[PDB]
Amino acid sequence: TKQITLYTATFSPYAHRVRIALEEAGAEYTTYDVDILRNMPDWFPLVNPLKKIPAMTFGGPEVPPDQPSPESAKIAESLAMLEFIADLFPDAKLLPTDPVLRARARTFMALYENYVNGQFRDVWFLGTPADPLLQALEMLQGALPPDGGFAAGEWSIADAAVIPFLARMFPYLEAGLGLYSKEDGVKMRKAMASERFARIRQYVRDCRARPSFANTWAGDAEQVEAAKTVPMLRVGEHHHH
Amino acid sequence: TKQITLYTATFSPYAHRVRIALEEAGAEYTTYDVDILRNMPDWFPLVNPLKKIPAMTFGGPEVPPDQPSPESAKIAESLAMLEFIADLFPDAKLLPTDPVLRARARTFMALYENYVNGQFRDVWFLGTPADPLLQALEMLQGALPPDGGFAAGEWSIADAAVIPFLARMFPYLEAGLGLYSKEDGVKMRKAMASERFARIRQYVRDCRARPSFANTWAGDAEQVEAAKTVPMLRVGEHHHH
Ligand SMILES: CCCCCCSC[C@H](NC(=O)CC[C@H]([NH3+])C(=O)O)C(=O)NCC(=O)O
Ligand SMILES: CCCCCCSC[C@H](NC(=O)CC[C@H]([NH3+])C(=O)O)C(=O)NCC(=O)O
Ligand SMILES: CCCCCCSC[C@H](NC(=O)CC[C@H]([NH3+])C(=O)O)C(=O)NCC(=O)O
Ligand SMILES: [Ca+2]
């Protein structure tokens, strides 16, 4: 009964996480785009004082999203929102019930956030060498069940946390978007197509095939165009060596 | 009933996080120290392929910790362990039951891990400027309930996650541990004693007063000595800006 509003942006893989989870929960919710990196509305700090997307309001009176209510709960940080949606919709089984399988899901989320995300950031925003990123991706791939399935076996919020980033990698590379050089762009594209990374390719296909991805994805070319609006992706710019 | 073994090290605030939660859970468990930074045992990758402390084994036959069983579940990443202990011991109420209050706990953990922890790392190990760390700490302080209490009201695993790091700050500063300059040491000691940080001081006192802290802390002087065994805290080195 309590309303959910997700403040979103098409380029934001963090917001994408939460859209995927809300779809998997079968939740009723509103999305509201915010041009957070170029033209933040003056009211936005009322829903998130950190001034980041995603932001979520929960409950309170129904109001237009650009007139947030002080009575709604203000929830920040995408992974906290993922666990929140699992808590709100237990019958949707967005986590396993078995403690050890739940821990696989939490561990996978931590592996991505602690060791992989920053490597994506270094390569895409600074143009540092790709090898440490490929190494981190091989580590993450190693945590998947080798014979198939999602991070914790059945689909869980762990896969909502990770697919937005992995799914952007291939189309961004194909467009040459990011501060890495052509040489590293080619090296990454080759690596990600090689048998070294067959398992994570299967993982990306399996996550993308679910309705929760299809219904929250603009299309590869459309996502690339939204990403080009990101100031620190510096479209047209590349660092070398 | 299944066995819990936590591979530990006194200097590791990440391991401290999990000892606190296990104490709060009233769990039966074994700890085993690992000299992970100076002399990793050859068997240690069997309990954590990432080669980090903490590591946890769960279940399997009862064996000496230096003879780990292939049959035990291997759990990595301290925050995943915190959630696992909450899942294993629901009657200990290591999280709230209310979804919004649970979200406060998850958000607080994310705020620390995403915005504060890296500033502690960069100030202590690289000697980067202290002001961004103090800014991040003011942000974290602002997430606390203003009138007292823990991150989500009642004590929760969010407080296990954060106190190891905040509790080390004061004695480390007083002992001059870290690669930051003299000027930034003075600045941080003055700030952390100023009215600006009264709320987080009460928070640290409130967390330290619980038996779960007292029974897992070696003492301030002892923790300082353990931290001096960390190789990248190179004695006699300071960075300046
Ligand atoms: C490949 C494109 C990546 C684009 C940047 C990431 S999406 C927008 C970005 N959001 C975040 O940084 C949120 C991270 C936060 N830790 C979470 O998990 O929700 C933001 O609002 N940033 C504004 C700010 O940090 O001030
Ligand atoms: C193919 C996928 C490419 C993924 C690129 C990385 S985007 C995520 C990146 N986030 C971080 O680096 C972590 C920031 C911070 N520690 C947090 O947890 O919010 C970011 O928002 N960075 C914003 C910036 O660096 O400008
Ligand atoms: C107060 C002293 C300063 C802190 C020292 C770091 S603690 C030991 C360190 N552990 C980690 O980095 C664990 C991080 C992991 N993300 C977690 O949450 O468990 C380790 O084993 N490192 C070995 C490695 O990374 O290879
Ligand atoms: Ca506040």
At which of B41, B66, B97 does a domain end?
A: B97
Q: For residue A154, list its beta bridge partners.
A: A152
Say if residue B128 is in the same domain as residue B148: yes
Query: In angstroms, how far is CA B172 from the centroid of its own chain?
Result: 14
Reduced to 3 states (helix: H, G, I; strand: E, B; else coil), residue A74 is strand
Residues of B within 8 A of A110 (CB-CB) are: 76-77, 79-80
What is the per-residue burial (b if ≥16 Cβ within 10 Å, else e) of B138-170?
Answer: eebbebbeeeeebbbeebbbbbbbbbbbbbbbb
Give me ligand 1 centre to Cα A36, in Å.
Answer: 9
Is B103 at the interface with chain A, CB within 8 A? yes
Q: Are residues B129 and B77 in the same domain?
A: no
Q: Resolution of this entry in Å?
A: 1.5
Q: Do residues B105 and B93 share a domain?
A: no
Whether residues B84 and B107 fall in one domain:
no
Q: Which two tokens stand for residue B35?
A: 């000299």
Residue A37: Cβ within 10 Å count: 14
Query: Residues B124, B80: one domain?
Result: no
**What are A75's two structure tokens?**
């929830």
Candidate of A38, A53, A81 to mutate for ligand 1, largest count of ligand atoms within 8 Å of Cβ: A53
Cα torsion B25, B26, B28, B29 to 10°: value is 50
Are A88 and A153 in a shared domain?
no
Which is the closest atom of ligand 2 to the Cα of A14? Answer: 8
E strand or H helix at B5, and its extent?
strand B4-8
- Say if residue A163 is in the same domain as residue A193: yes
Closest atom, ligand 3, to C-alpha of B12: 7
Range(s) of the domain holding residue A74:
1-97
Burial B116-133 (b: 16+ CB within 10 A, else e): bbebbebbbbebbbbeeb
- B-chain residues within 8 Å CB-CB of A80? 103, 106-107, 109-110
Lay out the sheet containing A30-33: strands in order across. A30-33, A4-8, A55-58, A73-76
* Ligand 3 within 6 A of CB of B178: no
Q: Name the domain boundary from B97, B132, B163.
A: B97
Partner-chain contact B80 A109, CB within 8 Å = yes
Q: Say how far apart CA B170 and CA A180 lie, in whole Å.
A: 41
User: Are A119 and A224 contained in the same domain?
Assistant: yes
Experimental method: X-ray
Residues B141 and B59 in one domain: no
Number of independent structural domains in chain B? 2
